[PDB]
Amino acid sequence: LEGTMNLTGEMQPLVEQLMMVKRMQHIPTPLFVLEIWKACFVGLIESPEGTQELKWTAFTYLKIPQVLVKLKKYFHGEKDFTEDVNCAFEFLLKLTPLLDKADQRCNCDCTNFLLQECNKQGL
Amino acid sequence: LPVSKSLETLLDHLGGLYKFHDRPVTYLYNTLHYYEMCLRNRDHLKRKLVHAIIGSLKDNRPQGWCLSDTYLKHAMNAREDNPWVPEDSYYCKLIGRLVDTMAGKSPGPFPNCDWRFNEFPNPAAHALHVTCVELMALAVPGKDVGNALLNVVLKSQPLVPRENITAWMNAIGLIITALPEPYWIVLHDRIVNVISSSSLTSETEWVGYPFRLFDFTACHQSYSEMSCSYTLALAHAVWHHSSIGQLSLIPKFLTEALLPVVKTEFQLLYVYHLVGPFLQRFQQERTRCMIEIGVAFYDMLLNVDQCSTHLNYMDPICDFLYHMKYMFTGDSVKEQVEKIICNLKPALKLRLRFITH
Amino acid sequence: AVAWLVAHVRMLGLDEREKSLQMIRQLAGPLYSENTLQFYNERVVIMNSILEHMCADVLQQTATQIKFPSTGVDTMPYWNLLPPKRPIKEVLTDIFAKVLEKGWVDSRSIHILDTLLHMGGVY
Numbered sequence: 001l002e003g004t005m006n007l008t009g010e011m012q013p014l015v016e017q018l019m020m021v022k023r024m025q026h027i028p029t030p031l032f033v034l035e036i037w038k039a040c041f042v043g044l045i046e047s048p049e050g051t052q053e054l055k056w057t058a059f060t061y062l063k064i065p066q067v068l069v070k071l072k073k074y075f076h077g078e079k080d081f082t083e084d085v086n087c088a089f090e091f092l093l094k095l096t097p098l099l100d101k102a103d104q105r106c107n108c109d110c111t112n113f114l115l116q117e118c119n120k121q122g123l
Numbered sequence: 124l125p126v127s128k129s130l131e132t133l134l135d136h137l138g139g140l141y142k143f144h145d146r147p148v149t150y151l152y153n154t155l156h157y158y159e160m161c162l163r164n165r166d167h168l169k170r171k172l173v174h175a176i177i178g179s180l181k182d183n184r185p186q187g188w189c190l191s192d193t194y195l196k197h198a199m200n201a202r203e204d205n206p207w208v209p210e211d212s213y214y215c216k217l218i219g220r221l222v223d224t225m226a227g228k229s230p231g232p233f234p235n236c237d238w239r240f241n242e243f244p245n246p247a248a249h250a251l252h253v254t255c256v257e258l259m260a261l262a263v264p265g266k267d268v269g270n271a272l273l274n275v276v277l278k279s280q281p282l283v284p285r286e287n288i289t290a291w292m293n294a295i296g297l298i299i300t301a302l303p304e305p306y307w308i309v310l311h312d313r314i315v316n317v318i319s320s321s322s323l324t325s326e327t328e329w330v331g332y333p334f335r336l337f338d339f340t341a342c343h344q345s346y347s348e349m350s351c352s353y354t355l356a357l358a359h360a361v362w363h364h365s366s367i368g369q370l371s372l373i374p375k376f377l378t379e380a381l382l383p384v385v386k387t388e389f390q391l392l393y394v395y396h397l398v399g400p401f402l403q404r405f406q407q408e409r410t411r412c413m414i415e416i417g418v419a420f421y422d423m424l425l426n427v428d429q430c431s432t433h434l435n436y437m438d439p440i441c442d443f444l445y446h447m448k449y450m451f452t453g454d455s456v457k458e459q460v461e462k463i464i465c466n467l468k469p470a471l472k473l474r475l476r477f478i479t480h
Numbered sequence: 481a482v483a484w485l486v487a488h489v490r491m492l493g494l495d496e497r498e499k500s501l502q503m504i505r506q507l508a509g510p511l512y513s514e515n516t517l518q519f520y521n522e523r524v525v526i527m528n529s530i531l532e533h534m535c536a537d538v539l540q541q542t543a544t545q546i547k548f549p550s551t552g553v554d555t556m557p558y559w560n561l562l563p564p565k566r567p568i569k570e571v572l573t574d575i576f577a578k579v580l581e582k583g584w585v586d587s588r589s590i591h592i593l594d595t596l597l598h599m600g601g602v603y
Contacts, residue, residue: 004587005594030329039584042345047587050554091329097348100279344584 003059033088045105068123138178145179151255156303159265173260187232215282222294265305277353292360300365318354324387333389337396366404374415391423417456421463441474485536506549
């Protein structure tokens with residue numbers, strides 16, 4: 001919803017909502033990060049047809065400043081996004097056919113994903 | 124064989140006589156069943172006999188067969204070179220030809236003359252002889268054909284869709300079940316060598332939760348499309364459409380291959396999700412192999428209990444085994460399991476205490 | 481063009497004499513006959529056409545078929561997509577009964593949800 005309906009408003013409204021739903025539910029950092037990444041990758045694949053993918057990719061690369069701000073603010077001194085992010089990536093990299101279809105949609109997203117992964121090395 | 128050269132030219136003489144009837148499917152199935160382990164002597168000459176057996180298919184004129192034209196284009200020159208480059212796409216189109224026989228233009232160019240002899244009480248036999256003869260001229264069939272056919276799902280291709288994936292699994296199960304023994308023998312190795320042992324055990328994952336992962340239709344979303352679930356769904360479809368006589372190979376398969384390849388518990392859960400629903404199909408008439416599958420499950424349970432730290436996902440397993448004994452076997456496996464259940468852990472013992480009745 | 485689409489959606493226009501002028505205005509007929517130096521005779525024209533096509537969509541539905549002024553690769557992906565003569569209680573029939581199984585919110589269906597919300601009533 002935050003991706004399709006809107007694109008602006010990034011002070012921390014989506015951050016606040018994600019935190020709030022994180023409190024009152026099962027809140028593992030691995031599961032939370034896999035969930036945000038799965039919602040980030042299920043878009044850009046089935047939703048866009050033409051010029052919408054150019055916005056889906058901008059959303060996928062705006063998602064990581066959001067998770068960076070979240071790591072800076074939400075978590076502090078308890079698995080400081082060094083171990084849990086890796087566990088979630090392993091929790092994500094296990095599902096290969098999803099990433100295969102994602103690369104097949106853009107037809108060049110394999111190397112693009114390789115760059116987006118080292119792009120997420122800011123956190 | 125060597126007298127086989129006698130009718131190699133005879134089919135060129137009386138090849139027109141076959142313009143009346145045509146059943147080469149059984150003639151080839153009865154040939155590649157157990158001879159395939161030594162069929163290379165016949166296949167080096169099938170390098171030529173591909174143009175002889177094709178005499179029956181060439182001695183017609185319906186003008187409804189479409190992919191047969193591509194097969195001819197690739198098999199009428201360089202009999203070992205042409206159909207080999209686009210193998211994946213070729214198999215995808217070949218099985219799409221059958222999977223579209225339920226929604227697309229099914230009563231169109233294919234069935235005619237006169238819809239009562241059009242080979243349409245069942246159209247699957249159209250894509251059987253092709254799969255056979257296209258590579259019977261080579262030494263490839265038996266292990267690579269069936270595996271490459273199965274490789275159209277887990278190795279997703281841009282020509283394979285994602286909506287009717289269950290219909291495509293049905294098509295695979297219907298195509299594979301009719302091929303002879305070596306073709307559908309792939310499933311056992313495809314399960315054991317890769318699925319149960321890809322890593323799946325030490326690198327298990329935070330994925331650990333089995334029940335959501337194994338069962339298909341979890342690929343309703345683009346997520347949870349793990350390559351191990353694909354094989355489980357495909358094995359389900361195959362065992363379902365082939366649930367006539369090829370199920371007699373599962374007891375020896377389990378009690379010979381699956382024992383020293385299982386150490387953890389979700390491997391046992393995968394074996395359960397494999398051989399669970401077909402227990403009623405077995406109990407229908409094959410009442411013998413029931414006790415063998417039961418004692419195989421018990422032995423796998425002992426093997427995982429002897430090597431494990433904590434058994435957490437065993438609570439549904441207890442009632443699974445309960446109902447499996449209650450509504451399928453009764454008291455027939457009792458003498459065999461009395462000396463087997465005792466070597467378990469105290470928790471599992473306290474749970475399955477009621478089995479002693 | 482936008483102002484008089486607004487004017488036509490307010491007036492009757494039963495003779496549809498305004499559409500005959502709007503089509504000629506939006507028409508890409510003049511291939512820069514006059515030597516008007518712009519450096520974007522094709523790009524600016526395509527931009528103007530796809531911009532005009534973004535508006536005047538609901539209007540051309542209340543009248544004869546659109547004159548196809550855009551002439552682009554793909555049209556706008558997001559629209560009503562609501563059946564002509566069908567009751568609004570279709571969320572339970574098709575949308576919600578599917579999302580209960582299809583548990584990723586069906587990014588194409590979220591627009592249907594928003595349209596139904598602001599077309600009916602929150603209560």
